[PDB]
Design a protein around this ligand. Structure first.
Ligand SMILES: [Hg+2]
Ligand SMILES: [Hg+2]
Ligand SMILES: [Hg+2]
Ligand SMILES: [Hg+2]
Length: 263
């Protein structure tokens, strides 16, 4: 709760939008994080003064353990650098986890495949897929109670085109006239409490679907979209945060490609 120290930075012009090519705030007043919308120095101050600890979770089973080295090494270069980080690697091959050199204040836990642990060890949880690599800054600008990430292939599409689950028989059902954005199942997070609420909710919904003999079109992702539609995220990350340059190239609208799929 302490006050920020004296800081010197350029003034923001009230009569000058920061980005004139994209939407930077949702209808429920949640910021949409694009390069240029934030001053990382101010945000780093706020979060360091709180001695914020960020948990980063990834599941690496079978052949996916092969992606851990690059994932962890690039995260060390771009993920929450300067802040306390705790990586949680869930895997069926504990011995196959690469020994990556970590910066100070950063640790890694290998869990073989304990929620109570999270509440006690980190302030925020970030959940992503392992077959990725960081290519640019991914920092505290994303931290908030609950956040979703705009899917790179649908940020410019009409909602009718969103690949939401369209069957009323599914708990993830979302009609053609509903929906704000199409979020990625591979990059979401927020406070431990909000994240556990989301996963707990999606777990129950998927069980209901299973019992009813139905499986959502895009599984976990379909349910995450239903959850975020009914519980608006406090921050929305732009496609900068999960991109696939091989399939989508590098649009002018993207000033940075921070987290990407591995070819
Ligand atoms: Hg998680
Ligand atoms: Hg859900
Ligand atoms: Hg689930
Ligand atoms: Hg989910």
């Amino acid at each position: 709760m302490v006050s920020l120290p004296r800081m010197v930075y350029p003034q923001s012009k009230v009569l000058t939008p920061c980005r004139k090519d994209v939407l930077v705030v949702t209808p429920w007043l949640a910021p949409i994080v694009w390069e240029g919308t934030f001053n990382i120095d101010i945000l780093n101050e706020q979060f360091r003064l709180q001695n914020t600890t960020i948990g980063l979770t990834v599941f690496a089973i079978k052949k996916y353990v092969a992606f851990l080295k690059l994932f962890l090494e690039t995260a060390e270069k771009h993920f929450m650098v300067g802040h306390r980080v705790h990586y949680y690697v869930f895997t069926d091959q504990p011995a196959a986890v690469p020994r990556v050199t970590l910066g100070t204040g950063r640790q890694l836990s290998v869990l073989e495949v304990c929620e109570r642990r999270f509440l006690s060890e980190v302030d925020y949880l970030v959940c992503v897929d392992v077959d990725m690599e960081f290519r640019d800054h991914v920092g505290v600008e994303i931290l908030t109670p609950l956040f979703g990430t705009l899917h790179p292939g649908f940020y410019g599409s009409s909602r009718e085109a969103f690949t939401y689950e369209r069957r009323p028989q599914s708990q993830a059902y979302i009609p053609k006239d509903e929906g704000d954005f199409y979020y990625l199942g591979g990059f979401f997070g927020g406070s431990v409490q909000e994240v556990q609420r989301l996963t707990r909710a999606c777990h129950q919904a998927m069980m209901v679907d299973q019992a009813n003999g139905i499986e959502a079109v895009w599984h976990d992702e379909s349910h995450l979209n239903k959850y975020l539609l009914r519980h608006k995220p406090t921050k929305v990350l732009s496609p900068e945060y999960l991109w696939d340059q091989q399939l989508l190239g590098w649009p002018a609208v993207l000033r940075k490609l921070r987290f990407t799929a591995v070819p």
